[PDB]
Amino acid sequence: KCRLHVNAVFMGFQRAQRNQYPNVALLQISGVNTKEDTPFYIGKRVAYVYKVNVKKGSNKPAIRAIFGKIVAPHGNHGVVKARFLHNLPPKAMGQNLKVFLYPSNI
Amino acid sequence: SHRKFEAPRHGSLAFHPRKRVHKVRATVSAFPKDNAAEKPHLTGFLGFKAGMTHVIREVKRTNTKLPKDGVLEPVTIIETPPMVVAGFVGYKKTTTGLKPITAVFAEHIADEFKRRYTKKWYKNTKNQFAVHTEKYNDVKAKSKRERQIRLIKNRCDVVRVIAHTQMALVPLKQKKAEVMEIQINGGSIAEKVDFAVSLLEKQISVNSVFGTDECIDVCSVTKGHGYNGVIKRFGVRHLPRKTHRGLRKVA
Amino acid sequence: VFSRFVEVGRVVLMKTGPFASKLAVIVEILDHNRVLVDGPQAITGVPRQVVNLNTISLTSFVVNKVTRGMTHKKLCLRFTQDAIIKRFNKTATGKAIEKRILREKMTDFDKFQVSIINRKINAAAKIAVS
Amino acid sequence: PRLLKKTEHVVIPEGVNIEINRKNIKVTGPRGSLTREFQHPKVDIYASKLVVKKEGPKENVVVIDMWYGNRRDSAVVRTIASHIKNMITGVTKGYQYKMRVVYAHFPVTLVIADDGKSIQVQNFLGEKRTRHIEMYDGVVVKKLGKDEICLEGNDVEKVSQSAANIHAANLVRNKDIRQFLDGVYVSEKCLIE
Amino acid sequence: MKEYYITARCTDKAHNPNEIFRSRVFAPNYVVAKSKFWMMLKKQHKVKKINAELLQCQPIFEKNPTVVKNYQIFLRYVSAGGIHNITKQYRDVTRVGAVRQMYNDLASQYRTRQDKIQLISITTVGDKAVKNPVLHQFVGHHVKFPMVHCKPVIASKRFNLPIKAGKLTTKLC
Amino acid sequence: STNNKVTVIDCHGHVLGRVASVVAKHLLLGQKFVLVRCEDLQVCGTLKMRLVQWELYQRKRVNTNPTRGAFHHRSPADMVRKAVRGMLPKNNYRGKLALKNLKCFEGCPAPYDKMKKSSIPEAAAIYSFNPTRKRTLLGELGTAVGWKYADVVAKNEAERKERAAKWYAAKQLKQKAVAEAKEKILADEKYKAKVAILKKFGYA
RNA sequence: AUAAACAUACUUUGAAUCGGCCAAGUCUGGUAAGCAGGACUGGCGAUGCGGGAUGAACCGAACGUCGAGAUAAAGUGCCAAAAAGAAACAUAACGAGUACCACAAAAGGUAUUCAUUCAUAUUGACAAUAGGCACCUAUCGAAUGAAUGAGUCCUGAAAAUGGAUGGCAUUAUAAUUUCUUAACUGAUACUCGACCGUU
RNA sequence: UGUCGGCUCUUCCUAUCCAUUUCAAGCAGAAUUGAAAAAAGGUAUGAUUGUUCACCAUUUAAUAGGGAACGUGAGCUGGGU
RNA sequence: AAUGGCUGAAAGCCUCUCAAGCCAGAAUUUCGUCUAGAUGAAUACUUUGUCUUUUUCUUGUUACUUUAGUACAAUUGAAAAUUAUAUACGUUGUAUUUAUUAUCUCGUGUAUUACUCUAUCAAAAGGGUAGUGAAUACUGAGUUAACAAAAUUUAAAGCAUAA
């Protein structure tokens, strides 16, 4: 119908050389090449929507989502920190995450 | 510490690993380098070894002190009955070596060649090349064959004839023929396919391939010996008589 | 032979910083990397400052009778006499500079008409050739 | 240190025509055409006009210019400029390399081929092996006189190598070269005209 | 790099309290400027901070940071062998700007870190007193050179994509 | 969404180790890469010293069993996969999955010769190199170390250049006519209202 | 002057322990030693955490269970979280690349960069050409010659399984030396808050 | 942690003995001497001694020097200790 | 490779190059030859023609059997080479994912297509010819939406026959 989101790549969690903090996930929004273009996205919704091959004998949804918020910039290359309701699965590394346009501030 | 005395190593590492082959026929791993300024010709044949005799040969070489009465040499006898060409295949030079393109086969195929495509012939329905033969003369198949001929002349660089022997002319109990791909070294690919098509179903004699006083290469499979020890396999030195647990081993 | 030279009086175009896409004039060459641009502050707003050659681009205009260390008064006279602003706007870069400013004021409705109109015009131009 | 600009040029006499296409100079003159490729990524070659005499007129000159660059690089401006001078000279007055033959006791026979694109050296120091020595495309060997030959050609790089190729095939081995002064040498290098 | 004007006096038995020691010190900040100033007094006049009072430590700014001048820095540095006096010429628009050039040139050509160089004096020379072979080529009025092999300039990091579509070209610029 | 597209990288005039760093980083970001012409890459060093480095590389081999030792692939398409594999996580599912999305081919095979090509400005030899430095093509080094198929690619590329050359001219005429036909309807009076809109925004 | 009331002064009973080891802007014996023995201090032993790839001692910092934030040593081409710009001597080489640390010397080079001193540089210095190897003449017209010092480079540089700037790789760097920008990344240490226990 | 030497066998180093390619000599030839590339190939038979070592008699293009837990004892021998 | 040379600057001369560019030169290196060898390719017959899983028969495999479920042809993706790139311009300043005006109905013909399909010549082609459909421009007009719903991407049981 229409595209109302910008794809972001789940690069990985906030980490160090030999540590990992899955509370915060790092995202690379498409088209953001510097930390000065991040102020717009600080606070926008982010959704990790995935597909699960459920059986017809069940009632669980076949398309489930985990939502979260962009909270702060991370580095000088337009990388952001996102905190979700549940920590992202490491199986979803490098997949696409929808960066919505709400909560709007215009 | 270094070895006291230096001696050459036993055996050759150019042949390791020493794995026994599976098929009796030995596929030649190369062919003489092609020259495009000559009449196309076959570059190989296939024969069955019969035995060895010895011939007294008069020496024609000069500046040699060999006796005038004639030297004594051993000679092997390789019976080579005529082989029947039953098709031809083109090859193309790609970035992963030669890649066969097609294989245009003859209308009539002997039962010897049919036996190669089965493992229990006496139980088979023996329907090899049945569709290829009964539908050979259709307009659809004839047009398809012309496409295969035309494809080779445009996108190929190597032509080989799928020639097979005739088991009926030898004392061997084997009935299924032996199939060999013989390259056609000669002119351009346009006249190679023309030569190849002219050879379909036509028997080729050995004299057509090899001439007189011709130096050739032979590829075959050596005589089997089964499990063997270190002494026979590599020629190592046998141990002194006093040795405990045995003599014929590498210490 | 190269056409554009880093000389005294050569008109250069700023490519980064606060004065990106603004004209400038070289009036000094300190070394192979640093030049003193004095694109008239009263005309284009570029202050008399030293800039690195990696930040500017050459153009096809040179202001006549410009000597090294020219004052802002005499340099302003030579800049307007050559009509540099008039000639620059007819160049490929000049039309590209005004395009960037022009397309930057579009709204959502503005981009709607252009996308619809041009897509119809472009399709029609394809029909006109057979 | 780094030179801001190094300028060298060569003068074009009225008989030769020079056309440059991306550092690829072709020079055609009365004797023939010579082509070369100066694949140096830091030189600009362009035909122009420049006064070269203190009180003389303007003439046609091929100009080679190297801008900011170290002394390791600026040394190639004179090298490339000299090569075009030899290219200009080669097609105007071809080069010749008079080569003489020296032997002690064994006479040497030079069997020059009919066309002149090959030679043959026989019985050098009483040897049975025959030295053939081919020639580059564009170089011709001729027999000037007795125990003397000359090489004719347009390219001084092809001629000199062919002249040196013949000498390098006739070196005395495992012997005192201060006494066995044998082989084909080079007397002098000059022009055909 | 900033330049400071520092004055002080010594009030004890050895020194009369009427001699004022002035200086012009190039330091990253004003704390370092006093530190440099005190060591000059301690190693030359036996004056220590415990027996001296500072008077004025004011910054010095360039009167005309728009005029190109040729400088001549006289300095002494310490090498592995011994101590040497060197004179270097620089082209810049500010006195503090040229000093940073000298520090960066000394630390690269001579591998001499900052805590070996002492700046004796810095003056301004004419257009013909320049003796540096490279710098002597840029003092004339008729100097021009085609800046070539330019990498295309990006307006800002905003448009700096990692992967670009189409061929990449340099510029005759 | 799912990025099913493939980013075709034309490795001509690039640096072997600078392409790999950009590609290997973006392979972990769920991107499918296909590097065409992985033998046109440039490595710093003349052919003399580049063979010395290869000579040292071929020395590393398991002494007790050469068939277990390091396998030295001479093909340039395999001299880039090894370089890329060195910058990916080793011995984990993340690194194995990010390498299955990479391909070099020596020439330009049937599907990848008509896709849009992309370049890496961080890896171009015209940006990261001194022009006086001598480099070495991977294909040129491949023959020196025993890559047999350096003549098939040179011939196959040539017939691809003379196939696209005639396609380019055919489309040049088609695009010239369309551009001249668009200018006709842009100047028509019936289309004045639409052109007035475009002229305001600078499109026309 | 500063600090100190869960301060200060203790009393009684008693456990374990007296094989030690390491660092050093330290010393003695020894050719030297990851050798032997000492003065002062700090550590390991008894000690995890972040960094140096890996390491008892090195650097930061010592630990109840957590949430969020600035930080430390140190890093910002990929493995690996995080940088962009500026100038130079390096690099045609298994040269350079994170201290303790896991090696290199004397010496030589018309290799290269900078600086100092001296002489010749004009109507004419050197090289070249021609004339009467040194010397003088004309053209050629702008730098030339000599010494010394400081950096970098090359030689000096040979060992045994195949291999180690950590690896891939880089080469007007993705190396080195120094900078600029209210740049960034990051510990169980610091700040705020919540809960558990001791005083 | 089976403590010398010898036998059998493989591999590695070059600070090369020979063969291959080179430069220098107080290198006429022959025979040599000094040095560079190069470790892919070869480098022996016996009297005495447990000997490593040594010293002899030959043959050879040469009869080079070393490492691998002073390679190698669920491989041998047990001559020495 | 060592080495000997060619042209040739730096350094007007000289010089094999601690410069660009070449030649000759080893029991050397790589092709060529030999042995083992992975992913593979061609042809012959048995099939199948949107797709899968769980069972299940066989020494084993394939086709095969039953009950389902799912989609149904029609705008995606290519100049090459060089970079001191002949001249002119510098065409500035966001690569893929990610560029269609909600759906349906009535409308006239023309034109276009790296569009689909049919036939033919060819062809290891974003091929030629003819025909048909689809979308678009000329270019309209008309209905409907409110609350609900707008997910396939994979399931479960068998062995009659043939190779």
Class per helix and strand makeup of chain F: alpha/beta
Question: Could you give the order of the helices and strands of chain A?
Answer: EEEEEE
Which protein chains are joined by the largest interface, and how many residues does each one contribute? C-E, 29 and 25 residues
Indicate the radius of gyration of chain F in whole angstroms: 23 Å
Indicate the overall shape of chain A.
Answer: globular
Can you summarize the main beta sheet of chain F?
A: 4 strands, parallel
Question: Shape of chain F from CA axes?
Answer: elongated
Estimated helix fraction of chain F: 40-55%
End-to-end span of chain F in angstroms? 35 Å
Number of separate helices of chain A: 0
Number of beta strands of chain F: 6
Largest sheet of chain A: 6 strands, antiparallel, barrel
Describe what you observe in this structure.
This is part of a larger assembly, with chains A (106 residues), B (251 residues), C (130 residues), D (193 residues), E (173 residues) and F (204 residues). Chain B has six helices and eight strands. Chain B is α+β, with helices and mostly antiparallel strands. Chain C is an alpha+beta fold. Chain C starts with 9 loop residues before the first strand and ends with a helix. In chain C, 26% of the residues are buried. Chain D is α+β, with helices and mostly antiparallel strands and 193 residues long. Chain D starts with a strand and ends with a strand. Chain C binds chain E through residues 2-8, 15-16, 20-21, 28-32, 36, 48-50, 53-58, 67-69, and chain E through 66-68, 91-93, 134-135, 138, 141, 143-148, 150-151, 153-156, 171-173. Strand 7 of chain E pairs antiparallel with strand 5 (117-119) of chain F, so a sheet runs across the interface. Chain F binds three RNA strands through strand 1, helix 1, helix 2, helix 3 and strand 5. Chain D: This is 60S ribosomal protein L9, putative. Chain D: Belongs to the universal ribosomal protein uL6 family. Chain D: Residues 12-94, 117-183 form the Large ribosomal subunit protein uL6 alpha-beta domain. Chain D: Keywords: Ribonucleoprotein, Ribosomal protein.
